């Protein structure tokens, strides 16, 4: 069963969560399904904001400013528990953006992809999680079916 429906079935990825707190990959796979979840909310939240014209804005705003920070901090700072490492000049764009303009969804798309890709061919995370005993076990519920 692969990665892409592994991270999109609540059952699949508790084992694939286990593997990574194990490994000492969960903070990858935590800052993804943080994004994830930051996107989603930024459209619902910003997608209001525009038939709210016909009305407390700063309110959503200021959140998502937030959300973004708190994403920044936990996982992309360079004063960070594990801390997702990739390009650098990505985070560093992502800060300047942060610093001086208000956040959009996708802000965190192009750092997202590059941990997405990580978390499939890294030999510590997905290909070694395929050669897991935690990966047969997750395996065993074809029985949830
Ligand atoms: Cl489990
Ligand atoms: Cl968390
Ligand atoms: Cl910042
Ligand atoms: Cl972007």
């Known amino acids: 069963m692969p990665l892409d429906s592994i ?3 609540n059952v699949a990825l508790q084992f694939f969560m286990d593997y990574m707190q194990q490994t000492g ?3 990858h796979l935590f800052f993804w ?3 994830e979840g930051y996107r989603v909310t930024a459209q619902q939240q910003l997608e209001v904001l525009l038939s709210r014209q016909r009305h407390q804005t700063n309110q959503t705003k200021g ?3 937030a959300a973004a ?3 920044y901090e936990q996982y992309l700072s360079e004063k960070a528990s594990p801390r997702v490492t990739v390009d650098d000049y990505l985070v560093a764009k992502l800060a300047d953006t942060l610093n001086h303009e208000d956040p959009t969804p996708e ?3 192009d750092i997202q992809r590059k941990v997405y890709e990580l978390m ?3 030999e ?3 290909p070694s999680f395929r050669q897991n005993a935690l990966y047969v076990r997750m395996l065993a519920e074809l029985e949830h079916h």
């Open 120 to 122: 499939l061919r890294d």
């Open 63 to 65: 959140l998502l400013r």
């Open 7 to 9: 991270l999109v079935d």
């Open 33 to 35: 399904m943080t994004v």
């Open 69 to 71: 920070v708190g994403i």
């Open 25 to 27: 990959g969960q903070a």
């Open 124 to 126: 510590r995370f997905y």
């Open 107 to 109: 802000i965190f798309d």
